[PDB]
Every structure is written in structure tokens, then in C-alpha cells.
Amino acid sequence: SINNVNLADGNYVVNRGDGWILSRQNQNLGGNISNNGCTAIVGDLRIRETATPYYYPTASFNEEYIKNNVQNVFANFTEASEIPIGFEFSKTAPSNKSLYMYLQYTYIRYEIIKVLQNTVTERAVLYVPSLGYVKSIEFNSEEQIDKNFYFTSQDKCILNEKFIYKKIDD
Amino acid sequence: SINNVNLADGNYVVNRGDGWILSRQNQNLGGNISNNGCTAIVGDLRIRETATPYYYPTASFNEEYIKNNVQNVFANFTEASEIPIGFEFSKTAPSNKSLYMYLQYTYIRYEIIKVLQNTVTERAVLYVPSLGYVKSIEFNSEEQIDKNFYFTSQDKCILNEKFIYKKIDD
Amino acid sequence: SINNVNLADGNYVVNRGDGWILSRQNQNLGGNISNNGCTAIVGDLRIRETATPYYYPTASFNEEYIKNNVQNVFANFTEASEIPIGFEFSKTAPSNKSLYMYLQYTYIRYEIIKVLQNTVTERAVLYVPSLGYVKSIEFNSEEQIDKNFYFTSQDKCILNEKFIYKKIDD
Amino acid sequence: QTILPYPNGLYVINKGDGYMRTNDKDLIGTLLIESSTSGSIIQPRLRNTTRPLFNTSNPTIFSQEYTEARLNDAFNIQLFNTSTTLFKFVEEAPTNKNISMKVYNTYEKYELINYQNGNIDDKAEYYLPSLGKCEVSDAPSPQAPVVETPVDQDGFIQTGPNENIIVGVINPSENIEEISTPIPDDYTYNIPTSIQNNACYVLFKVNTTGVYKITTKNNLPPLIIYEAIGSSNRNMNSNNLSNDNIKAIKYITGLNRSDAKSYLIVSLFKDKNYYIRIPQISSSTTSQLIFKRELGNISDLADSTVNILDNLNTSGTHYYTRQSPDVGNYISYQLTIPGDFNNIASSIFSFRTRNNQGIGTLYRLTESINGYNLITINNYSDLLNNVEPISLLNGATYIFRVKVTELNNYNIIFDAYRNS
Amino acid sequence: QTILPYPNGLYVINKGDGYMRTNDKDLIGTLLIESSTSGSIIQPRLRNTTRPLFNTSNPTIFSQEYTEARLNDAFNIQLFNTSTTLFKFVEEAPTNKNISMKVYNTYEKYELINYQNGNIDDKAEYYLPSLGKCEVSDAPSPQAPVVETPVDQDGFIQTGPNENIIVGVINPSENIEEISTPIPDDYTYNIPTSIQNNACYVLFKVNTTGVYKITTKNNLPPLIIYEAIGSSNRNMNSNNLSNDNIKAIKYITGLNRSDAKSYLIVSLFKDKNYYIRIPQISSSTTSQLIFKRELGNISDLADSTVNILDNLNTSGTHYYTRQSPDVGNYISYQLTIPGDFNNIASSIFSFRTRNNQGIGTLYRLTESINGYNLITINNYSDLLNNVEPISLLNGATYIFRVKVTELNNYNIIFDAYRNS
Amino acid sequence: QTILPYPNGLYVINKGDGYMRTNDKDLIGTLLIESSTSGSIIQPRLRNTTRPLFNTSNPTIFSQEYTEARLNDAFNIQLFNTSTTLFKFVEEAPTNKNISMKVYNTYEKYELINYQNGNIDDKAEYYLPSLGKCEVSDAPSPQAPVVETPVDQDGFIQTGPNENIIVGVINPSENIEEISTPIPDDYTYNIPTSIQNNACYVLFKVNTTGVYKITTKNNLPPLIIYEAIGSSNRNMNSNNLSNDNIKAIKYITGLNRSDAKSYLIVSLFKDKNYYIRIPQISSSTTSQLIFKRELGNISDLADSTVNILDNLNTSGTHYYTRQSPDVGNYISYQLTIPGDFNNIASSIFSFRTRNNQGIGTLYRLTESINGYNLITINNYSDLLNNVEPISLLNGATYIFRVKVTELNNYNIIFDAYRNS
Ligand SMILES: CC(=O)N[C@H]1[C@H]([C@H](O)[C@H](O)CO)O[C@@](O[C@H]2[C@@H](O)[C@@H](CO)O[C@@H](O[C@H]3[C@H](O)[C@@H](O)[C@H](O)O[C@@H]3CO)[C@@H]2O)(C(=O)O)C[C@@H]1O
Numbered sequence A, B, C: 001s002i003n004n005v006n007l008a009d010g011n012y013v014v015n016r017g018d019g020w021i022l023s024r025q026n027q028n029l030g031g032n033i034s035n036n037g038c039t040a041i042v043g044d045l046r047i048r049e050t051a052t053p054y055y056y057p058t059a060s061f062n063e064e065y066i067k068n069n070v071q072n073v074f075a076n077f078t079e080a081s082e083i084p085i086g087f088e089f090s091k092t093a094p095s096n097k098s099l100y101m102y103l104q105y106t107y108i109r110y111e112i113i114k115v116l117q118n119t120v121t122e123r124a125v126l127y128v129p130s131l132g133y134v135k136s137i138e139f140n141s142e143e144q145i146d147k148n149f150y151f152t153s154q155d156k157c158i159l160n161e162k163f164i165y166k167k168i169d170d
Numbered sequence D, E, F: 001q002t003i004l005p006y007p008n009g010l011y012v013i014n015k016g017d018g019y020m021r022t023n024d025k026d027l028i029g030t031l032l033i034e035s036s037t038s039g040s041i042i043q044p045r046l047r048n049t050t051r052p053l054f055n056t057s058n059p060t061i062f063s064q065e066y067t068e069a070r071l072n073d074a075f076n077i078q079l080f081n082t083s084t085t086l087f088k089f090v091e092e093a094p095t096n097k098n099i100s101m102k103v104y105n106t107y108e109k110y111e112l113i114n115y116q117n118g119n120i121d122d123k124a125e126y127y128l129p130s131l132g133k134c135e136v137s138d139a140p141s142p143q144a145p146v147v148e149t150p151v152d153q154d155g156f157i158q159t160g161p162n163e164n165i166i167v168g169v170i171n172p173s174e175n176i177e178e179i180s181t182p183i184p185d186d187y188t189y190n191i192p193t194s195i196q197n198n199a200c201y202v203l204f205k206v207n208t209t210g211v212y213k214i215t216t217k218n219n220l221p222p223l224i225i226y227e228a229i230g231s232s233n234r235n236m237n238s239n240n241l242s243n244d245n246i247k248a249i250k251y252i253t254g255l256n257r258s259d260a261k262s263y264l265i266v267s268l269f270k271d272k273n274y275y276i277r278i279p280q281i282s283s284s285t286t287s288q289l290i291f292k293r294e295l296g297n298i299s300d301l302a303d304s305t306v307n308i309l310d311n312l313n314t315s316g317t318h319y320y321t322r323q324s325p326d327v328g329n330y331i332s333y334q335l336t337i338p339g340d341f342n343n344i345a346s347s348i349f350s351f352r353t354r355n356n357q358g359i360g361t362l363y364r365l366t367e368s369i370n371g372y373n374l375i376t377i378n379n380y381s382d383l384l385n386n387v388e389p390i391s392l393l394n395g396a397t398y399i400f401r402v403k404v405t406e407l408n409n410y411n412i413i414f415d416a417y418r419n420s
């Protein structure tokens, strides 16, 4: 399963990659509706004030342990959060149809794993606010939509997942 | 004329539609000049601070009476005014000619009419700041322009006028 | 040389034109890198707080003398500086290559010259912050770049130089 | 420098957009846009401050604040030195060449003038900050030879399309009287004693659309009538005149000349508000303003001042100097032929004008218990050189209508030449 | 107005985006875009304030703050009355015609309901400010005749795509117990005395993925099990259950009916967290929660409530009313045939359902020192009209599985008709 | 790791743009752009704060503030930790595939070094925040197999185009003297006593463009001359040297070796400002700086240090180690042949170099009352392996010019081999 790694015993900090979307938060920011060739644009500014990290600590790895170990090897998100960054998406609705697009935040998944016998014994998780992602769909009051379009039941990555590690010392 | 309505006697609040431009205020915001294929863009932000309603009360219908009766059936413009909204227009000047475009505010015309024998006896008027409208014209120092292009002598609607009513009670 | 003018004796204020870039300040604002058909955009806002004039006074012409004499005939840059103005440049990187563009400020070169026998005896210089200019180049880790692309050793004008004068009185 | 066919008073003239000063005093900046690249210059309004330009021939009265107030009366301009209105220019250079993008700040020129008897006694020029000008052209050569060029004269040049919109405003120093109730077919208004001290305006509206005769009981002094611009189709009350304090006025017809005995015939619409300016009377006797709706083809004179001609029982020339209507507009003259009435008794007349050219129409004024009636006697396609005589019945009344076709002078001279 | 196949409790239903009020109460503005011109309407968030809309059938309990808290439990919504999210629409008019651009503010409709025994006893509607709606069409004619049109009824219309996502949340008034250590193949949990006062949830995770039998020692009261949505693959500890306080729950299987003697058979994954809601017992005797991992094809019933049938030793009908699973889901029934066992001794039965339609599967439950084992005896493609009888060995145990194919009623009626 | 053909002192090297740290420490974010959709990442400068990166081998002296001051002297950089400069990337995905847009923050690398005798004794690296990097590629597969990859080494990688611009700056610890009046054809400057305590620079400009000979009365110590970068065509005064405090200097010619008896021959332009660095003398006797404009083809040596050769009246090798000019630049040697003069009396010489390769030119130095004059005696296309001997008149003076064609070592060795 997901706990079988090929690493010497010890504690590691891992970069699971950018592009992670969270469970059921799909439509928290709202959606946009356009039609007949109109261009629709949605965007945002991950201002520190809003974009806050999601911590999932374990016994061996508390919040602080996770933060310091992530910001030591990978991008220091605490410093970066002070500088506003924007992102936008645009799409043109079809000639005689309606377009719906909704926005959600993306994150960088970081992990603190405890290895023992090539198997993960403990796993802490951190989601650092990254940018955003939009999903589109064309429609008309008739159509029935696959509900998976609107809902994500399990955290996942819209890009290819990653596993970039570094053994923690001390 | 404009006073002949087909409504039972009583007082009504009417939505005369969006898209109304006011008498002689055509060039109050200024105009823009471009040439030879350049793209010109003008826009604005109807910030409460600027965009203020125009009231034309009668004896039976004072300002307050008009406001409350409009915001009760139709869009509450007093609340909306707290949230800045923007609009822009762009146009490309012709290859070897000059382009002139000027901007003006548009409004929603609301009316409070007193009916008696299928005829309007009293009429109060309100113009709620909406968005904006631009007029263009190509030119060169020579050309003579129809002055109606620059001046609107009577309030009018750039879209189709409307008559959406609701009898007032109490 | 550059000191031979065809003007009666006396002191003059001259507009050497817009479009002047300064010596070795080429990359002070930084550069931008894009690739594979991506569109890159860089811009700025010459806010008084940043954009400051460069004075090069002589004995006969101090800072004040230069300012007042320039703002008297030509654009008053001290007043204008209170109003933020923006400018941007955009360019699309080639399909399978990298694009690099860097930005630098442009200026209006003004001069206060002392004439005597159709020759400039004294020359004061002022550079009024104007807008900006970007330089592009395509590349790949291999290519060697002409260093003149990155460095300007002598102040120069990217447009055609000018000589618009007016004899100073008093 | 052309003739201004308007009555005495204040006027705000929008002289056009795109005005800017010489010597690049309004140059914001120039962008050199390399080929296959786009450049843009923006006025983001990160600051809402704008800098209007002002100039006046009389700082005491026509001050900037005063002028701004007139501009508000004329076009209802709200903001004079601030703006939230953004303007931006975007240009892409071709693959083959480099482009030069110059952007300037601009102004709309509003001229405020005190117009008195075909003359401007006071003048102010207000330059309202506008939305800029952008000039794009092929980038000049960095090597182009430098040419010593002397600075131009201090001043303004017009960059926008041609424009000259005249809007008159109520003279703020003359009081406004108001006839509250919509006037019926007949109405007499007593001019308040305040008239002895200065001219005034009487604001009113008619209960029924139609043509009206308006005058003072002695046809003196002459009256002037205006329309309240944009007053139509706003707040209304069948039993009451709703106000808008609209100080912007459109001159319909009327004169200022003191000895212009006359009355007005104008078309009035009930959905509109009008102003009648009554000159300063300067007498202890109460004057009146009489209104009367006219049924019948007297409407042919619609919007015209009917000048009553005096001293006709003489031979030869009979000149009457009057302020000329604008090209296309009317000015009328009423003539009661000297002598007693009896069909056969007549007198020969030759109608002519002297300063401005026009088209004439001769009417025979007749009475009926159904109002008046005009009978066309003749028409003239050339008044300046008319030589054709016409015999008119003595003791009869004729009205001569002139439609101006050529405005050569402030005044139009009418000559009712008596041949016999 | 359709059936809701869920256990009693709270639910937040996302009813879709694009909701807006009638009579243009949410109209932001209209742009008339002339041909060869582009128009744009922007929500720049120069102010982050938004105005949510709220409506409730019970202000005391289902207040706005309470509802907002439920919405947070369901979808984890952070901001309710602010937004930094921009939306903008851009449209270019063709060379031939003018375009009309209308933009409205919109809302996402979240419905919070208190669902009790197939009934909604309390309801609140929260309208979360959304990212707008833009309508572009050919510009109407300024001359189009005006039609007197009466205002519509006050209310909301749906403008976005169809959507109805149901998310249950932990009842905030029922406490959460927690089995810290990942349960092994066998585990007994003693229900705390707090159970006498109100229902509770027991949060836990299994050490090994597989099928499990879960029940109270007397198969009473009936249990309900949920999955903690999004609990999978987050923080983990092999020797400890890591918490997320995830209050969003996915109903797996279980009933509320007081007399539904039963036990659950469900598929459980170790990477996930689950909740077992234990009803309020109301007895001084300590109850237990027994867990047992099952090996074998008992997994055929995976995610199903196995109802133990009572009072079978009679003739004729044997009805059992139970809350119906949703279309595609299971509900099982266990039958120990009356009489002693001896292969030959049998009894005739006719299985049928009465409210909802479904597909049936008859199993013979057998024992082994390797766990249980099911032998398929028969299958039924029509339960509502099944007439086919079947003889079952007395003293033997059979399990009948029903897969719902038609949800006509809140309850599904099972009839174990005894022919003999 | 290559040779740096420059005199001792401080240098700021712009090593290029696009530098960023490993392991995505500068990754701003990634956008997944679905087909027929556009994505954009923006640095709006809603906050003007930037975070420079710094590294030094000597915190005491080469501190960040000190380094920043050098960077200001070199490129005149104003803002180090703030920016109002926006950067933004826009990408549209095709109709067929999804695109991945990665954007990173970047830096321009400025290297400050203390260069002493072909060696860097102190070094600091300043990373000036830049305008980012954007990488677009086909979106990776969400299903792409995950590969355990160990983190890279902490550090920087270069992403921008190759660049290495060297700019020397005035040593801030050595004082600047100034010759106020534009020097004429001849000029002698007395070196202030401050020279005993440390080296200094003498800022000046020539009244007339042309070639100049510059030296100390004893051709010792050796002088170094620089140009003040960007000093040309700014403020000017025919009777006075206008200052710009330009601390950015371009090395023309000159050496540091203590025993390099010599004088400089350089081309000087009046519209420019120059600096002559005089080493620390360390003697109680007053030294002088003599300037003399030279007319004639002595200009052939333009921008070259003319080294006077000593101890020639011996046989065999005569080595002279000197700091090597850069490829394409000159370095000269003056030779007065041992013995008395009389046309016939001569001596055989073989010119050669040992470290760096170059092109040689042998001149016969002659006097005239019209200045000097050089007569070309021979040319050498290969100095490293030259074996061709040449006979030179005893008591005569020859100048040998070397144009470097190959910079293999910090020093260029000149060998004036005497055959007889
Ligand atoms: C047929 C006839 O009499 N025509 C006159 C007309 C008419 O009498 C008049 O238009 C009334 O219908 O007047 C003309 O102008 C003179 C007239 O306005 C008188 C009135 O007072 O003033 C003359 O000028 C005066 C001026 O008012 C004084 O301020 C000044 O001190 O003295 C002047 C004396 O000339 C007008 O010339 C007309 O052109 O309409 C003359 C006709 O002959």
C-alpha cells in the first residue's frame, strides 16, 4: 500500500508535490456562469490573512516539528505568505450554451514519515496553500451532472504525485 | 401619451428598466482619443462615494417613500453601493484614422405613479446609478460631427424601455 | 562635436527628447524568463516615491535654476509626479525556446546650456523619469550573448534625440 | 469669430475634447515598442486627483468657483478636480517594425461667456481634465539627425473631433418666479414689484400642449422664452409644477431691444418646463404677463417673435433693426395698413431685408369666433433683393414671416417700403 | 419531494450554484456593447464584503450562526460573508450588431435539515455569495414597444447546473467517544453510562482492512455506521488513531427502528476513520459493542444491515417494515427456520417485498472452523411480484439479501410468507 | 575559474539573471490549465517587499550593507529590498491537451570581490530579487507513477541567459584627489603627502582629445588609469571639471607590480572623466604626476603600459614578468640598446613571451621637434615560439608592442633574449 517505502529506518520530511486539492472543499469559493461566447474570468490573491496551512500532526511530529522541518529543506511558506500573489483562469462559453466553472485552492502536500523496516509507522501531514484550480462544464437546465464533478471525497493531486525526501537529523 | 396606463386605480412602483442616460451629462467624465490601430480602454468604479442617486419627488411621494418602495420590490441599491463594481470598454482605432470615445453613467429608472382612470396623475422619478456606456466616432480635424452625438437633450434609455410594476399597499 | 550650436549667445533651456536610458542601470529592476509560447508581462508605476530626477548642475546653473526653467517651458514634472501612471510590456516566448526580457526606466533629457560664439561653454543636465523600456532576447543555456545587450556604458536615447530650445531671460 | 444668434445672458460652450498644451506640457510618456511586442500606458487612478486648467478675463466675478458653478448649471458636471475614470492604451508592434507610443493628458474646453448685444463682455475658459490622447507611429530612427527647433508659443491645440455645443444658463443674478399651477387656455400673471429692480424669469408649464400667444398687455417690454433642458418626462403632478431647479436653458424665441413692441407665438408641450425672462420694467405701474392658447393656423408662426410695426403712414423706407434668428429660424412682423378699411382701398408695399438673407411669407391676418386665421398672400425666395411690390388693403392687418437662410450680421434689418 | 434514504440526523445539502432573486434584485448592471467594441463587468473585491442570504424554519435552534457551523462541518467552508475571489466577464460585439451584457450576483444554496423518520422537522436555507452570472444576447431595440408587465413573486430561481449533493454531519448534540487503538480482529467496547442520557458516536479504525461484523451483544439496539469523509490518507500512527475532528459523515449502513434486532456486515479500510452511532440505550445494564473481522464469502453482504426475523413459526404473512436502502444498496434478513434440524424436514417460504422493488439473493448460512460460508440457493429478479415458493430446511439458517432497484417509499417491506 | 586580467581592487560582477534555489525553495506555485482555458500567475506588488539573499566570506568588512553600497557604486541600484515592478505570465492551453504552468521567484547574482594579485581574497554574493521564471509544459499524468527521489543539494541554479559583466568600483578606502581645471597639453601634478599613508585616485579631464603620456618623474611607481563609466556627455564646464561622483570605473591600462618602471600612453577624450590611481608611495620626498599630449604615431601604442627594460647589457635571457592584458589588449616594452650610438654598431635580439601568446610589433623610437615617431621594424605573428633574431643599433631606443591573443596565465612573461 501507501506505507511501503524503500528507505533506511528513521524520520523523513517529504515533498508530496504541488497541485493537491482538499476533500469536499470543491465549491467553497463559489462558481461562475456564462453563455453565448462570453469570456469568464475568476481569480484570487492567496493573502496570508486567508490562505492558512492545514496541519495534521502525530505524536512524534507536532506542528512546530513539521513546519521547521519543511521550511528548512523546501520553500519557506511562512515568509512567502507575507507577499500577495495572484492567479486567474479564463474560459469562453460556447456559442449557444452555458458554461459553469468553479474555483478551489491547491496545496503542496508535505509529509513527515517515521520509517521502520521499509514501512511507514507514523505520518504527519501538512498542506501549504499554493494557488488555485478551476473546473468547467457546459450545461443547460436539462442536463444531469456527474456529482464527482462537484465533489472530491478524498484529498488528491491534480498533477502527478511526488516523493522527494530528506532524512531528518538530531 | 406617456400617462395612459392600463392599471387599476392606486399607487405603483415601476421599474422603467436599466440603460438610462441623463440629459446633457454626456461628456462629464471626459473623452478618449486614439489612432492607427491602437486599442483604447476606458472604465470606472461606481464607488458609493461618487455614484449618487437622482431623486425627483412629488407631493404624494417623497424621497424616503420612493427609496423604501423601490428597494422593497427591486434591487436594494443602498446596500449594493457598499461594494465597488467595475466596468470597461475597449475599441481599436482604425488603421489610418482617429477614434474618439466618451463615457457616461447609465441608470435604472424607477417610477412611483399615482393612477386614476387609467391615467397617471402623479409621477415621482428615481435614477439609480447602474454602470456605464461609451459612444465612439472616427474622425480627422476636417469632419463635422452631428451634435446629437455629443449631446442628449432628453433623458432616454439606450436599451428597450420597460414597465414592470407592483401596486403599493398601506 | 556636441558643443557646436547655431544659437545667439546666452543661456538656453533645451528639451533633448524623451526615451533616454541611463548608463549601466540596465538591469536594476530585474529580468523575466519564459518559454514555449507563454506570454510574459512586466510593468511598473513611476510613483513619486520611487521615480526621482537626476540632476547634474554646473556653476551657472544650480538645481533650482534647472527645475524652474524646465517646468516653466516644458512639462511640470514636479506636479505630475503626484499622479501615479502605469506602463507594461508583454511578449510571447517562442514555441520551443526561452525568452528573457528586462526592464529599465526611460527619461526626458533636459539641458541648460551657456552659449558663446556658437559653442556650448557650460551644460547642466536633468533626467526626468518618464516611463520604461524592455529589451528581449531568446536563448538556451548554450548561447553566448553580446554583453552590450545587458549593459549601456553611455547615456543614450532609444528614440531620435531632440533639440527644442528657448532662450532664458532675466 | 462668427455671429452668435442668442439673447443677452450667460452661456457655457463646450468647445471640444482633446485640448492639450504645446511643447509637450501634457506629455505623459513615450514607449518604444519593439516588433512582436505589446506596450501599454495606463492612468489607473491609484490617486483620484486631476488638475483642471482655468483662465478668465475677470477674476472678480468670473472666478474659477463661479465658472465651475456655471458648468454645473449647463452640463451638470459633478467632479471638477477628481476622477475615478480610468483610461488605458494598448498597442502591439508588427513583426517587421518598431512602434512609438506617445500618450498625453487632455482637457475638454468649456467656455463661459457674458453675451451682451452681440458682444462678449466677459469670458472664462475652463479646461476639464479628460481621458487622454494616444499617438502611435513608426518608431523614429535613433540615428535620425537632430534638428535645432525653437520652442512653440505657450498655449493650447485641439486634438479631438470638432465640437461647439452652446448651452445657456439662467442668469444667477436674476430671480426666478414660479407659476405653480399648470396654466390653462387663458392666464394672466401679475409681475411682482421686484421687476423694478432687475429682470426675472417665470417658470411654468401648460396644462395642454398647443400653440400659445404670450405678451405684456402693451406688447412692451419684449419677452424671451426658454425651455428647461431635460425637464421633460421627469417628476410630474397634474395639479402642480414639479421642480428640478434645471438652470440649463434652451432659447426658443425673443428679443432684448427695448423698443421691440411685440408678442410671442410658440409651440408648448405640457411634459416640459419653460422660462419667460421679463426684463427690468422700472415703473411704478404693475405689468402683466398674458398667456393664451391659440387654435388655428396661427401656428404657422410657431416659435417666432411677432414685431408690431410703427410709423407706417409715410412714404418710402420703413426700417426695423432686430436681433437676427439663427439660420432656419423665424422672426415675424405685424402690419396694420394705414387708413380705414373698405376692400378697394389699398397701398403698395415692397418687403425687403438688409443684413441677413431669408425666405419670406406674407399672411393676411383674419378674425373668427374660432380664433385667428392666416391666408397666404405670397412667398419670397429672396428678401435681400426683392423688388416685387404688393398691394395691401388699408385698415387691414398682415403678418410677414422671415426664415433666415443667411446669418451675415447680429441684426437682421426689415424694410417695409411703402410705394404708395 | 422525493424519498431520502438516510438515517435520522442532520444533513447539509448543496442544492446548486447560480441561485438569484427574482425581479433583478441581484442585477449588478447591464452594458450595451456597440459593434466592434468590447465590454466588461468586474467584481474587483476592492472591498471583501459579501452579503449572504439566510432563511430558517426555526430561528431558536437553526439560527444563522448554527447553520453556518453545520456548513463548516459539511464542506469546511471558512468564509461566509467575505471573499477575495474575483470574477469578471468580457464580451466583444461583432461587426454587424450590438450586444447586451447583463451580470448578476449569485449564490450557492445550502440546505440544512433535521431529518427524522423520513421527515424534515426543521429546515434552514443558507445562500452563500457566489461568483456571478453573465447573460449576453443581441441588444434589444431602443424602440421595442414597452409592455406593462407585473412584477414576479418574491423568491429565488436556479441559474446554474443541476446539483444535489448530500453530506451528513455529526449531530453536535450527541457526544463522540473514541477507541484510541486500531481495533484488531476481535474487539469488545463497553458503552459508557452516558448512553442512558443520549445517543453517541464511536470513532475508530481497524488495524486490518477486511469485512467486519459489528453488533450489540443482543443485536439490540440497531447500530448505524458512517465513514469520516476525507479521513483517508492523512495523519496516521500504526499504534494510534489520529484525529481530524472531521464532522462530515458518509452513511454506510444501519437503521433507527427500535425493534430492528440486527448486526452489521461492512467492508472497512484501515486508512479510513469510521463512526458508529449507538442510540440512547436507557437502561442501567451495561451494553457492549462487539467487532469481529470475518473471513469468507460473508462479504457478499458487504455493507448491509442483517435483520434477524422473529415470530416465524406461524403460517402466512410475516411482514417486516424497515427503512429502505437507496437504489443499488443492500438490506438483509436472517432466518432460522422453525423446527429441529434433520436434512429432510423442511418448510415452504415465498419471499416478497411490498413498497420498493429489488433484486433478491437467497443464501444458506453455514458454519466452519474457518469462519462462515454462504451457499447461493436462488436469485430473484422481481421481489415485488415474486410468487415462486422455496422449501427451506427446518432448524437451518438462511440470509436473504435485497438490492433495491426502485425507491418508491421511505420504508421497504419484507414479507417472509410461510406456505407451510 | 578563468584568469581575470584586471588590477588589484574591488569588482562587482553581474553573473546573470534567473538564479533560484534548488528543491523548489523559490517555487511560487503551479497551475493546471485545462484545454481551451487560460491560466495566469501574477506578482501584483500589492506589497512592495522583496527578500534579497546574501552570502559573504567576510561578514566584518564585506557585510550586506557594504556589499549593497558597492552594488550601488557599480550599477547604481537604488532599491534592494522593495519593488514596484510587476511581472505576470499568461498561458492558454490548446484544445487537445492540458498545460502545466510553474512560476518561480528569481534573482540576479552580483558578485563582489576583493581582487589582489590575480587572487580573490574576499568575496560576497548578493542575490537581487528579480522578475521571475515561468515554465510551461504538457500537464503530467495524475496517474504517473511516483518515484522516490532524494532532495538535491542546498544551493542555486542559473536559469537565465549567460552573463558575466565586470564593473570595477573606486576602492572606498582610498581617497579621491581632483584636478579641477581641464589639463592642457602639458601638466604637472604634485602628489599630496597623503600618498604616504595610502593609495589615491586623481580625477581629471583633458581640455583636448588626443593621445597622452602619463607618468611619475622617475617612471616609478607604476600608474593605473580608469575611465569613469557614463561620465561622458553629462554636465560640463569648459573651465571646470563637473563631478558626478561616479564610482564605477573602467580599467584602461596600468599595473600594480612595484618594480614596473614605466609610463602610460593612452587615448583620452575631453567629454569623459578619468581616474589615475597612484599607489602608496611611502617616502618623504614629493612625487609628481606628469601629463603630456603626444602628437604623432606614438598613438600606435594607444592604451598601453610602456615597461622600461633594465639590465640589458648581459647575454642570454632577460625575463620580465608583468600582469597580462586581456585578449586583444596591449602591453609594451621600451629598450635602449646597451652601448654607444653609431649606425653600424648593433646587437642581436630575439623577442619571445612565455605564458600568454600574442602578436608582436617592433618599433624604432625616434625624436623630432614635432614630437616622437615610430618606425615599424618588424612584426611577429607568434611570440611564444618566435625564433627569428633581429639586430638592433646600440645606443638606440626600441619599443616592442604585444597584443595578447591567448590569456593562459595571470602574468605574461616577456623575454628580450640577447644573442650578442
Ligand atoms: C419705421 C421706423 O421708425 N423705424 C425706426 C425703428 C423703429 O422705430 C423701432 O425699431 C421700433 O419699431 O428704430 C430704428 O432704430 C432707432 C430706434 O431704435 C430709436 C428708439 O429710441 O433709437 C435710435 O437710436 C438712438 C439710441 O436709442 C440712443 O441711445 C442714442 O443716444 O441715440 C440714437 C439716435 O439714433 C435707433 O437708431 C431701427 O433701426 O429699428 C430706426 C428706424 O428708422
Ligand SMILES: CC(=O)N[C@H]1[C@H]([C@H](O)[C@H](O)CO)O[C@@](O[C@H]2[C@@H](O)[C@@H](CO)O[C@@H](O[C@H]3[C@H](O)[C@@H](O)[C@H](O)O[C@@H]3CO)[C@@H]2O)(C(=O)O)C[C@@H]1O
Binding pocket: E259, E260, E261, E308, E309, E310, E311, E312, E317, E318, E319, E320, E321, E322
Ligand atoms: C412477523 C412480525 O411480527 N412482523 C411485525 C414486525 C416485527 O415484529 C418487527 O419488525 C420486529 O422484527 O413489526 C411490524 O410493526 C409493528 C412493530 O414494530 C411493533 C413493535 O412494538 O410496533 C407496531 O406499532 C405500534 C407502535 O410501536 C406504537 O408506538 C403504537 O402506539 O402502537 C402500534 C401498534 O400497531 C408496529 O406496527 C412491522 O411492520 O415490522 C408489524 C409486523 O407484523
Ligand SMILES: CC(=O)N[C@H]1[C@H]([C@H](O)[C@H](O)CO)O[C@@](O[C@H]2[C@@H](O)[C@@H](CO)O[C@@H](O[C@H]3[C@H](O)[C@@H](O)[C@H](O)O[C@@H]3CO)[C@@H]2O)(C(=O)O)C[C@@H]1O
Binding pocket: F259, F260, F261, F308, F309, F310, F311, F312, F317, F318, F319, F320, F321, F322
Ligand atoms: C632582466 C631582469 O632583471 N629581469 C628580472 C625582472 C626585472 O628585474 C623586473 O621585472 C624589473 O623590470 O624581475 C623578475 O622578478 C624578480 C624581481 O621582481 C625582483 C624585484 O625585487 O623580485 C624577485 O622576487 C623577490 C620578491 O620580490 C621578494 O618578495 C622575495 O622575498 O624574494 C624574491 C626573490 O626571487 C622577482 O623574482 C621578473 O620576473 O620580472 C626576475 C627577472 O629575472
